[PDB]
Design a protein around this ligand. Structure first.
Ligand SMILES: CC1(C)O[C@@H]2[C@@H](CO[C@@]3(COS(N)(=O)=O)OC(C)(C)O[C@@H]23)O1
Ligand SMILES: [Zn+2]
Length: 257
């Protein structure tokens, strides 16, 4: 099945998932001098006070921190969004080295990693229905650079030893995702897709301008994770990012000048 290696990676995905070459694929390079400032965009509203985290899972591609999405406990609204989008999970993509790892790029710059907070449009009732709709998901993307430690990330880093291999999960309750955000909510936005198979074209991308800083020790612990399952030969979980895809017939809007 699919992965990020030479024989099953992004270059191969189109065979099982021909949408890989479709009209609104993600990620993309954000050319900052082509994006259009849109003064009509309302501020982003990130409401995570009642967020209820549940469990963390190594899924053999990255790791998911899952949330209780049975009520409007943690929602994203405003910006380019119509209505209410409920937080369901977050995960990251990262590199083998600090100079690569992000999925989106900014003027061709690759960050060390990228955080994705995934939300679904409540008008569609559940996540599985939402992914079948052109406005089904909103994914909030945040770049990571290596510098000072991110205190709000440490609880995540601390638990990775217990989910080293594919299929392993651990209890991950009472985690506050607000600790993962930068100060500024300035953003770029464009219509795109899931960046992994089945690559469904259901995502409003909201990518924050301001990266968060994480320490070298924090990112190093991400890179000790394994793609393989327990007892199998070790394949380090690194470079689990899809490269930039053609922008095609799309416009990236900016919340800021
Ligand atoms: C851990 C990783 C890489 O991300 C998880 C899961 C399956 O892929 C995802 C990708 O979400 S994304 N990158 O489009 O926000 O698609 C969903 C189903 C949203 O879950 C995401 O594997
Ligand atoms: Zn992702």
């Amino acid at each position: 099945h699919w992965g990020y290696g030479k024989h099953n990676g992004p270059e191969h995905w189109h065979k099982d998932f021909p949408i890989a070459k479709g009209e609104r694929q993600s990620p993309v390079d954000i050319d900052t001098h082509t994006a259009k400032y849109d003064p009509s965009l309302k501020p982003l509203s990130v409401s995570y006070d009642q967020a209820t985290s549940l469990r963390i899972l190594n899924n053999g591609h990255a790791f998911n921190v899952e949330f209780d999405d049975s009520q409007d406990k943690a929602v994203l609204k405003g910006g380019p969004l119509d209505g209410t989008y409920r937080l369901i999970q977050f995960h990251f993509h990262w590199g083998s080295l600090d100079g690569q790892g992000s999925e989106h790029t900014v003027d061709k710059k690759k960050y060390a990693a990228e955080l994705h907070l995934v939300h679904w449009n409540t008008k569609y009732g559940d996540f599985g229905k939402a992914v079948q709709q052109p406005d089904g998901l909103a994914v909030l993307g945040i770049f990571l650079k290596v510098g000072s430690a991110k205190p709000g990330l440490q609880k995540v880093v601390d638990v990775l030893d217990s989910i080293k291999t594919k299929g392993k999960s651990a209890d991950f309750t009472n985690f506050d995702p607000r600790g993962l955000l930068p100060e500024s909510l300035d953003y770029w936005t464009y219509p795109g897709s899931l960046t992994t198979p089945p690559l469904l074209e259901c995502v409003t991308w909201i990518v924050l301008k301001e990266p968060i800083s994480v320490s070298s020790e924090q990112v190093l612990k991400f890179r000790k994770l394994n793609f393989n399952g327990e007892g199998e030969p070790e394949e380090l979980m690194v470079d689990n990012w899809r490269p930039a895809q053609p922008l095609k017939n799309r416009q990236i809007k900016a919340s800021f000048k």
